[PDB]
Each structure stands twice: as C-alpha cells, then as structure tokens.
Design a protein around this ligand. Sequence first.
Ligand SMILES: O=CCc1ccccc1
Ligand SMILES: O=CCc1ccccc1
Ligand SMILES: [Cu+2]
Ligand SMILES: [Cu+2]
Ligand code: NA
Ligand code: NA
Ligand code: NA
Ligand code: NA
Lengths: 620, 620
Amino acid sequence: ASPFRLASAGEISEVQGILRTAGLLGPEKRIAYLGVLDPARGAGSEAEDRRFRVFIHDVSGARPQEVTVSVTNGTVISAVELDTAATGELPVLEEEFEVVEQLLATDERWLKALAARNLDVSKVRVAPLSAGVFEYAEERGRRILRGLAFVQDFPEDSAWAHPVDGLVAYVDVVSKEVTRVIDTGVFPVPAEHGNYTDPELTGPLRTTQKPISITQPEGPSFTVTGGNHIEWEKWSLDVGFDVREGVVLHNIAFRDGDRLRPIINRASIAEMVVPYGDPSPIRSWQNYFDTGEYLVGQYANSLELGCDCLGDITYLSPVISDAFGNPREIRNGICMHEEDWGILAKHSDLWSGINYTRRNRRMVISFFTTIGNYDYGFYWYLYLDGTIEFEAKATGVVFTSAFPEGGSDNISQLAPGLGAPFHQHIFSARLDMAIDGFTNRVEEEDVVRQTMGPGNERGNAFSRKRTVLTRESEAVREADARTGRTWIISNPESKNRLNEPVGYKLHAHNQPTLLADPGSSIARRAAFATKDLWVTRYADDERYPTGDFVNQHSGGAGLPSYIAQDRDIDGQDIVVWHTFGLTHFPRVEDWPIMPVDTVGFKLRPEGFFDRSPVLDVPAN
Amino acid sequence: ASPFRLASAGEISEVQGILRTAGLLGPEKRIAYLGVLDPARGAGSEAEDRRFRVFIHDVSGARPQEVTVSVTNGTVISAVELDTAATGELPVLEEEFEVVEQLLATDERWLKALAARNLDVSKVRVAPLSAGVFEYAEERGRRILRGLAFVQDFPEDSAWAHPVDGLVAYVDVVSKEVTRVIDTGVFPVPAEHGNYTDPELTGPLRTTQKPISITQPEGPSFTVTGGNHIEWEKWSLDVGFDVREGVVLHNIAFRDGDRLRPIINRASIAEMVVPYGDPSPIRSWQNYFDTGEYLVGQYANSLELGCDCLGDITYLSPVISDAFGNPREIRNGICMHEEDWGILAKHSDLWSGINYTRRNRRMVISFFTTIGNYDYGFYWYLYLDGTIEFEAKATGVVFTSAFPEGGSDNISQLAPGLGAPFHQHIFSARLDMAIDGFTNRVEEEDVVRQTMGPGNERGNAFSRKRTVLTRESEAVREADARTGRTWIISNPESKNRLNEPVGYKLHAHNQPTLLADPGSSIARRAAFATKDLWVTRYADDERYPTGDFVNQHSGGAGLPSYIAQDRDIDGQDIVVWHTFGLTHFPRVEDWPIMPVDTVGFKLRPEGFFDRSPVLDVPAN
Ligand SMILES: O=CCc1ccccc1
Ligand SMILES: O=CCc1ccccc1
Ligand SMILES: [Cu+2]
Ligand SMILES: [Cu+2]
Ligand code: NA
Ligand code: NA
Ligand code: NA
Ligand code: NA
C-alpha cells in the first residue's frame, strides 16, 4: 500500500504494454532508463498514482524520447522528442558494450594498427568508454563511444594486464561508422599476466585463517514490512532501488518517545565521476560518470551469503527493466543486517562506585556494482546514537596503460612496462533534508581562535562561529579542515528543551575536490565536483547534480544552473549536495587486484535530542 | 627469554628489595613511576640486562630521586636527586586524589565559601587537578594541585551533574597547606541529576535488541608465545605495557615469503593533553596531561568478556608496581582478538568471466583507561593487507560548569543551568620507524595541480611532488588537507622489484591542532600539539614529546629542545611524532554520559611489497 514500495515485475510489464500499445516501443526502440517517480510534495491525499519515467533510444537514428507513464491509470502522461545536440545523449546501453569491438574488428585502419603490433584481432578486447565533449565538431548530436584496447592471451586471462598503448578509436554506434583511428606510436604490450587466481602468482593459499562465526540465534532485531519498510532500534525508513542511482533511502525518521521525528526525506548517491589525470592524447579525454552515463544500479551484483555478506542477512531482490521492457530480477542485490560496533558508552566513577558499559551496533544496507574494471560497494549505516553514515568501498582492477621508458609525472608503475594513470573517484550525495519537518536551514560552523589579551588573559580561550546560508548564490561552500569546518542542518521552528533549534551536523572527510583546470571540459561537465557543499531549494525536477542527460552534454547542466535561481533557503524545503572523493595515485599493492579503499561522510545529532538517545540500551 | 617480555611480579619484588636494601625506599618514600627500559640499540649480544627506571617521591619534603636498577645483576645503576623547580615535578600519585578534598574540608576559607552556598561539606567532592605553571611565584618548586568542587546528593549520585562554579582552591600536598581560595561569586548549583542508571531517567529499557553471537569454533588464528609475542597472518610483534604510556607495540614486522621484514620498532601514544578553552579564572588554568601527569596505564580497567570485548578473546594481565613497590596485577587489562572486516577485494570480470571475492580481517589489541570523569579506549589494528591503524575512543562524562545566565561563547549548555566548557583531546603518537631496517627517511607528498596549456592542452593533468626532510630543523610539518598532504617513510637502501625505495604512507585525519594562543603557558608546555608532524633522530633518552617530568614544568621540554640539535634524518634511524586530536564543543547528546567519539591515523604500504600482499588469502 505504501507509495514508496519497490517496483514490481507486474508494474514493469504494464509499462511495457502501455508503451507498446501507444506505438512507442517498436523493434528499433530500446529502453535506456526506467524508474519509478517519487510522490510529489503533499502525498497526504492517499490518491496513489504510480508513475514511471522512461528514456527511449532508437537504433535507426530517430530522435530519442522521454516518456512518463501512469501504471495506476494505464496511460501515457507525456512523451517528448529529445534534441540530443542540445540536452545530451541517453545513457550507454549494455548492448553497446560489444558493438565498439565488433565495429573496429572490420575497420582497415584498426586492423593495420593491430598488424603492426602483431596482435591477433580475435584476442583484442576493446573497452567501451564514454566520449565526453572535446574539439571534434562532427560529434555534436551523434552517439559516440571511444575505444581503448587490451589483449587477452586466452579466454580466462585478465586483459587489464595487457594494455595496447598509443592507440584509440572513436565510433558512431548508431550509424556504425568508425570516425577516427589515432595511432601515436608503438608501445610494447606489457607481458606479465595479472591472473590473481593462478597458483603460480598466488603461491600456496594460507591455511592459517580460522573461521569466524557470526550468528543471531533469535533472529535479527529489525523488521521488514511491505517489502521494503525497515524498523530497527527506533529508526524507520524505506529502502528504494533505482537503476541509475542504486539504493535510495526514503523517509528516514527516528522514534523519540511517542513521536516519529523525520530527519532525511531522501538520501542517494546522485552522481559519481572518475576523471583521469594523464595528458597523453590516448587518455586525456577519459572521464566516466558511472552513475549518470552507465547507470550503476543495472550492474548490481548478486551477493553471496558468507562471502559478500556475513551474518544473519535479509536480502532484497529489486526488479528492473531490460532494454525491451521485460522485468529482470537482481537476485540478492541488496544485503541488510545489523553488526556489533564495539563500545557505545562507558564510565567507571571514582565517587559513585558505579561501573557502566554499553555496546553499540549499526544497521547496514549495502549493494555492490561492477562497471568494467571497477567494482564499488555502497554502504549506508544507521547507529544506535542517531548517527547516519555513508561509506563507498572501491576495489576491482585499476585502469592501466603502458609505463613509458624514462618515467612519467602522471602514471604509476605497477609491473615491468605496466602503468596506471593518476585519477580521482568523486561522488555526490544528494540529501533531501527534513530535520523535524521541512523548514530547514544550513549553517557553516568554524572554530574561532582568540588572541591573548583582556578577557582572555591566559590565552586559552577558543570559540566557534556559525554563518547562516540564506540564498542559493551564497550556498556553494568549500571545506576548511584547519578551522574544523562543519555544516549544521537545523529546524528554526523546532526547539529542544533548552530552547535551541534542533539540528544535525555533517562531518566531511575533507579530501581534495576536482583537480582539473577550471577551464577544462570536465570542470564544466562535473561542476558539482569543484566544491564540497551545495544547498538548493527543493524542486521536483532538480534530481541530479549533472542534469538528466550526462552523456556527451556540453556542460553547465545541473547544479550551476539550479543555483542561478538564487532562491531563499533560510527555513525552507532544502537539499544538501555533498561532494567527496578519493584521489588515487596507484601503488604496487593495488596490482593485480586492488584491496578496498574507502571514503564517505557522516551526520551526527546536534541538539536534536534532549539528552543522550541511548540511555535505554540494556546491559547485554 | 625475550628481552621484550612483560615485567613479572618477581622482577618488581626484586626491584623493591634492591631499593630497600640501598636505603632508597624508607617509610616516607613513594614510587611515582616504575617501568622496564627497552634494550639499547644493538641487542645482538644476547647479554640480557633487565633494567628498571623508578621515580621516587618523598612525602616529608626531601628531594625526589630518579633511580635505575638492574634486576639481572641486583644493583642500583644510578640514583640522581632531582631539583623540581628546574626539571619538573613527579607524576600525580593515586593517593593524592583524596588529599585535596581532605585538606580543604578543614580550611576556614573553603568552609566559608561552602556555607554561603548552603552545601554540606560531607557532600562536596573535590577533583584533584594538575596545576600547570602560571603567575603564582610561590608555586615554583612546590607540589601543587588545584581543586574544583562537585556536589554528591547521595553516595551513588553522579557528582558531575552538580558543579560548584565560581570557586577554586590551590593546595600544597607536601606541606599540607591551602595556599589560595578564590571565590568569584555564587552560581546556582545545577539541580537535575545525571544518574544514567536511574529508571526515572532511562525510562523502560529496550526489549528489541536480539543477541549477536560471535564465536571461533576452531579457536583464534593468532598465537601467543613467551607471554606477549604475537604471530598473526604474517604479522609478528611484541605487546608491551608501561604504566605511563599503556600498551606499547614492539618489533612490528611482516613475513614476506621467507623474509621477516621490520616495519615499526616501537609504537606508542607518548603523551595526551586536554586543554580547556573557557577564559573564566575558575578554569582558565585547566590542562591535564593524562599520560604525562597522571600515567594512563595505572588506571587501566579490567575488561569483562561479552561487555568490553566480544568474541574469542585472549587476555593479557600486566603487572605494575604500587606506590610501595609491591606488584599489582591488572587482571584482564589487555584484550586481543581478530575481527571480520568486510570485503578485502572483489571483482567480476566481463571478459574473463571470473568472479572473485575475498574477505578482510583485522587483529585488535586494546585497553581502556579511566582518569576521573574521562574514559578512553586505545585500539591498535593490524590488517591483512599491511595496513596499521590506531584509534582512540573517547567516552565517559564531560567536565561540567555552571551555564551563565545570558550565555557563553566558550561553554555549551547541556541541561538547565549546566554547562560544559569547550576543550580539545590531543594525542601524540611516537613511531620509532624501521621500514626494512633502520635507514629511513621521510618525504612530504602533496598533490600538484597543473595549468591548461602546452603539454596539457585539455587541462586534465595532475601530479604529485615529494619533498625529502633532511634535517630536524625542517622536519616540523603542518597538515594540508586541501593538497591531500601525506608523509611517506621509506628506506632508500631497500628497493622493490621496480627499483623504487620501499615505503609506508601515513594518512592523517587532518583535525585542528592546538587552538590556544602561541604565547600561552599551554602552548609552551604542549608545544608538540601545535604541529601535525615531527621527525627526530633516534636517541635513547628522547622518550616523550613533553619531556620526562611534565607536572608543573615551565615549558619547552621535549620536542622543541630535541629538534634544536638539527641532526641528519636523511637515511638514518628516525622517529616520527604525529599529533592528532578532537576538538569538542559538547552537545546535548553528550549528557549525562557521552557516546563514543573517535580519532586516529593509519599507515598503508606504499611500494613496500612487489604486488598485493593478500593474493594468497583463501576463498572462505
Ligand atoms: O566504468 C565505466 C567505464 C568502463 C566501462 C566498461 C569497461 C571499462 C570501463
Ligand atoms: O583526567 C585527569 C584530570 C582529573 C583527575 C581526577 C578527577 C577529574 C579529573
Ligand atoms: Cu582508483
Ligand atoms: Cu571532550
Ligand atoms: Na549543448
Ligand atoms: Na528538504
Ligand atoms: Na624550570
Ligand atoms: Na627508527
């Protein structure tokens, strides 16, 4: 009955039938994106209308369309033809992954380049990489992918160990033409393999690890109702899944006494980008938006009990659409479980004689996605004490190149002749805030140092200052770790028992933001990534920091265009967009498969409660 | 047989007898510190000599002494009388905790102040606080404690809820004189209780938490030999315990093939300080060095199975000396266990078809200490992939004051009339480095942004730069989160298979350092805390960043004096001192007992291995 329930197979089948009957899903059509729309502001009418948004690609060259469908009423609500030179191309299709390699295999320029390197075309894999927007006028309005080649010595070989440097091709995947083949010179193909399951490389496996058994003999402490509604240790929320964003959290609230208090209306990772810092023309165009260009939700892994998720695991299996509108289940795509988290609070008092210890725990909601060489785990954590935390876990295989004789300022050496270009992994979290309701504001909090002198005669005092962000034009903020800068989201109309506004404090990791020159293509297309914090006024259609159609969009879409409206954000319905990321100079230890590295953020209550919210936790 | 073994009860008894027979431990003497000395550089002689360092206090006013004893030979090696006006007072004794309250209870000025507030002297607890060095000439060379008062309504009451503001006293604990009583005015004593086990405050305890069972049916994967030598998943180390520093890690090494490779010779938390930022004369002198002034090891908790440490736990019970030289066991003072740590590495490859997942784990070595209102957990973690991490967990009860009518810029309000002054918790980690041996150097690594132009025509390139620190005078460094600054400890004479020097990278949390004015007393006494990173040349007697005798030392001891020697540190036996800390503006949620907050640092291999060191981890 909940409007936030997961999409069902029956809903997707109905969408398929509605589109087909309306003449919008002929043989030349492909669904590039399909997702349920959230209820509009003011769902207190019980008049449920399950609407779906669809992007429809046409493989024959016709204009793509954006379509909204009501499954509740069985109708097409709107259908708009898209001018992609203007508003951007549609996301990459899974079925285009193979097309780049296949088109290149019959191109005489490509075959000539492989012949000079004595490479068998049957052994050459081509990565299907998004194109961006650069100097090539013929690409405007065309659906382009760029290809970089890797050799597989045999079908089970890791091709990433054998990059073919000095060679790149550009392909129009609709007209099926190779537009350019660029060969800047022959590099030796690195010869060592990177097969991390080969006994010759691993050596004998360890026999020293003894098992760790994690069980819950009375079952878990959380309940799941309505398919995706979670209740756990005073938390309440709905777990959504979208093919673009992946796991989405709705209606995060905390039961404080007899009151259900909202905190976050919607939380998601709304974009991520991996810009490369190698100036070689073979790779200097390389920036992929895994979320906006490739759709991370459609590549979610099926997670194995005991290997991927350990303990008493509750799975969700979300349903998505394939390219033809058929429902497809991602079996065991989302893991949910609680974890012990050490000491929560402890004190032994010298005067009262009372010894007190309590243990902490967290609820974990996670999925894992794989897009080419990279694999990411997305983890949301809820803690007993009101803390909310996000963590991204990056692993997989680093993207490789040749390592030039004589070295490089922009590439790390991993093995003889094998390089890994410098790059970043930058995420955008979109937090549609609802601290005790929708009237919220953001304050920037800095530590204040004080000079020794009158009123501070011993020079020990220090303080803090809070600056309210009142309009969108002043709500683009940078980190300052040295001044301990944080941001507080508060509700000026909801006070705690001390008559102070209730709030939550955002703690960033203060990692570097986008390093590219501000005049670069990527700085214009990923403008969100140049600043740590943005605050906008809520609007239905302002969903992604990069805009709706990221692929081959010329720039400036999304957050820079939204904030130009300069709307009032002082005690209003607001959205916080937090940029955070890893800067990766690859190390030898990252090869041939990378141990996990992590980045994230957290939010902690700041006078939201009238005292510690975990006084009623029992003594185990 | 190992020279790094824990002190035994028999060793401490022998020290007691040696001191007694030498005439150094009469009835007026108290042992303020006793600890084993590490072997000198060049222990490859097998000529073991277990030596102990002792600080001896005299309650009758005689000069204290520093004494070194050889238990192996049964002799006093050296005994030096200390001039405490020059070199500092000895650490606070546990038996002095009671003396401040007892002396004040018979002082007419103190009783007059309590009478005006209608407080029963029998209900008034006095915190025994270290004095520092300020404007009071009569304190030089005298052993002073300062007292702040708190009311206990009944024996099991939390006195921290009832601070008596506006009142402070100074006491000479040797002459047993109250030197000053300062009363700046009457503040209401906050009336609400803070009893976190009272059902009226907790409400009904939760019944919703279901058990989490963590067991190891085949036992743990680590072995303990010789009492304190650990071997775990290619790691090797010795777990030490010192009454001042607490848990100390010796001889951290990693078994890489058939080679045992050193990484860290000695790791410890060598000082910690809590400076307060309230300019009221009642508290503006308040800065306690829990390690250097109070000795955190002697207040280690006995840790309970299932509550403090959960899983298959191996305990160590270190032995320390009491004030009379009797051995005292801290039963179950150190917990050791391994923990599952999620995904280690994962990839599903689109071209090879191979799906690969491995799980991570960490070895945990921890203890918990309690000094007055504060409780801290110290955690050392070793990971499968070569990462070493330290984490401090801060909990307990915040130090309180009145909350002034009309507010404060330096105090948070926690309850009606109840304040908590702003403060920091700042730690110093001393890392006696031994990356593949003792010839090490430190490089500072910054991200380098590049301008769009020739050789970077698309404005995407970025790089890194490394600066070698060659002499101690240039080895005092600050964090720079915006440039991604890290520090690499490498061995220039030990190369990996790519002919690059092996190394480890230190990742800081980049939290603010000491906020006090640089002309303040605390800035001079805690100079280490003003900078994020110091590198010194190893020397036997350079043990603590604050010097040997921190209590009432006038300033400049420790690191500022060491680095003035300007020694060569480029490929030498070096020590890294890392400052890290929390800046605490207390929140309502911290009251009446604070949920854990954390801070720390980690070190990750940086070309130390020839490839990922966890290829031989099996598939669970
Ligand atoms: O992560 C998206 C870029 C990509 C896609 C497919 C193969 C390699 C790299
Ligand atoms: O943490 C050392 C300062 C202290 C000691 C005893 C009681 C309260 C505070
Ligand atoms: Cu990376
Ligand atoms: Cu604190
Ligand atoms: Na355009
Ligand atoms: Na909002
Ligand atoms: Na002095
Ligand atoms: Na060293």
